[PDB]
């Protein structure tokens, strides 16, 4: 099989580990354990084996994000689209990560997860509120997804495979 590496970052509770579970086994769970440090999983989709570094998003682990993003094929930045109170912190952590010189040029996929919830932001609002327009020195894309209801999981995978 072909191989690629991706790193999944984003604030706690945004659905990073849930996303890995959904694309690995199709299984959504309402109750989850916060990731203490990092997880790693291999998932095969078609003929690409993807090695996923799933980093904890709790505050004390964000200092680790750059370490695990260096050299990978793409970074997936996960956002709880329904958690308005967290968007400001999510915006700041994303722009802080992308300011790191050793991550120059790596493509970024911003995922607005939990679109099934009633107050979830849509792709257009997420782009504005995360100031994605201000990123002009790398490829960046934004999709609104639901791990629970499965919206846009397939196009997310398609994007990741195009960056193998």
């Amino acid at each position: 099989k072909e191989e690629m590496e991706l790193t999944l970052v984003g604030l706690q509770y945004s659905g990073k580990t849930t996303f890995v579970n959904v694309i690995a086994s199709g299984q959504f769970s309402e109750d989850m354990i916060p990731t203490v440090g990092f997880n790693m999983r291999k998932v095969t989709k078609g003929n690409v084996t993807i090695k996923i570094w799933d980093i904890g998003g709790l505050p004390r682990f964000r200092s680790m994000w750059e370490r695990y993003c260096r050299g990978v094929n793409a970074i997936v930045y996960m956002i709880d689209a329904a958690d308005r109170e967290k968007i400001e912190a999510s915006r700041n952590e994303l722009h802080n990560l992308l300011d790191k010189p050793q991550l120059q040029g790596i493509p970024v996929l911003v995922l607005g997860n939990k679109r099934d919830l009633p107050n979830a932001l849509d792709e257009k609002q997420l782009i504005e509120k995360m100031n994605l327009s201000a990123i002009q020195d790398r490829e960046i894309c934004c999709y609104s997804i639901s791990c629970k209801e499965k919206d846009n999981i397939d196009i997310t995978l398609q994007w990741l495979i195009q960056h193998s």
Binding site: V36, G37, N39, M40, R67, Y68
Partner: protein
């Protein structure tokens, strides 16, 4: 003397070593406290961590390196492979341990052990400490005590290649 008692002893020795290192680190009056290779508390800790990870290896001379490369990011593997004064896979196992402590990552690695029993059984005998569910869960609890301790260990230590005999 029973293998269960032996494994229990190793874990008790890890427990005591973590506690002594915690107390040493908390009492340090340096402006930037950091555990280093020459600290006796570090040497005792790593001696006992190394025991737990070498116990029950199918191929002792290759060390736990051949397992943990499955769980380690590429740049860290490369960094260990190019160390000038670490020449063997056993030494690389120990340098990986020092790096894991530097990165406060031992818990994440031990969780990957629990999630990969197939890999564990390829490298360890059934009797091994990491192959016992009860013992591996306790090991993980013990090392969670190193999460907020600053380690500044030199990975390129030549004594790391010394094999048991």
């Amino acid at each position: 003397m029973e293998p269960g008692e032996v494994k229990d002893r190793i874990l008790e020795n890890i427990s005591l070593s973590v506690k002594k290192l915690q107390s040493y680190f908390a009492a340090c009056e340096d402006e930037i406290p950091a555990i280093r290779n020459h600290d006796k508390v570090l040497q005792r800790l790593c001696e006992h961590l190394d025991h737990a990870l070498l116990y029950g290896l199918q191929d002792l001379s290759s060390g736990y390196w051949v397992l943990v490369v499955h769980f380690t990011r590429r740049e860290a593997i490369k960094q260990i492979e190019v160390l000038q004064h670490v020449a063997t896979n056993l030494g690389r196992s120990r340098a990986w341990l020092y790096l894991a402590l530097n990165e406060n990552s031992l818990e994440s690695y031990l969780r990957l052990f629990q999630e990969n029993l197939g890999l564990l059984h390829k490298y360890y005998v059934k009797n091994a400490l990491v192959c016992s569910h009860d013992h591996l869960t306790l090991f993980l609890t013990l090392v969670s005590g190193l999460e907020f301790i600053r380690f500044e260990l030199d990975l390129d230590a030549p004594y790391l290649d010394l094999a048991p005999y």
